[PDB]
Chain A
């Protein structure tokens, strides 16, 4: 029984709710494709668009074995303008502790209450961010840890869904404004979520 995979599974489920919500509150897509729902006992917005939904799953399906190996240091939802320049980064900094501790108190009730706080902060972040320009799009950047091997082999999990190395323009953001959202430390997961925004 591999608890590093349990942790990968909680993170991928949560990262899916979180991408969907980010796309909502940053209005990356039209509002009508979203349905209000509850996850982590808290309101969220999930897209009902089939291929957007398939694209987010394929992305996260590819990330998940790196998560199970603790080989991922950040997962970044980056939002691009009509000119392919980053306007916002949503940085999920993730580290499993050196040894996972698994309580029988209620391991998953608790991590879910801690994840719920990340969702709530995402909801109210449009109260402090500048409205995005029209025609913005998104992508997902994965930063791996230094002792990680042939990531571009381990990460290509899905048949016709290649991964590449990003360019400097994909990620360039000279002197951004930093917006912390939430931080958690659990026996299984240390996670930071903050937003970098273009000056």
Chain B
């Protein structure tokens, strides 16, 4: 049985994705 990170990857709201699209190219 493998190892995995205890920490989950982030949840990304679509507003946050619009901000990424808008400001971080």
Contacts and interface: CB of A to CB of B under 8 A. Distances in A.
Interface of A: 29-33, 35, 47-52, 55-56, 58-59, 62, 74, 76, 137-144, 151-152, 155, 160-168, 170-171
19 contacts: A29-B12, A47-B20, A49-B20, A49-B24, A50-B24, A51-B10, A52-B9, A56-B9, A59-B5, A139-B4, A139-B5, A144-B2, A161-B5, A163-B5, A164-B4, A164-B5, A165-B1, A165-B3, A166-B1
Contacts of B14: 30, 32
Interface of B: 1-10, 12, 14, 16-18, 20-21, 24-25
Contacts of A139: 4-5, 8-9
Given A55-B7, A171-B2, 4 more contacts: A51-B10, A141-B3, A141-B4, A163-B3
Contacts of A144: 2-3
B14 to A, nearest CB: 5
Nearest to B9: A55
A170 B14 CA distance: 27
B21 A137 contact: no
A141 B2 contact: yes
A170 B1 CA distance: 9
A155 to B, nearest CB: 6
B3 A142 contact: yes
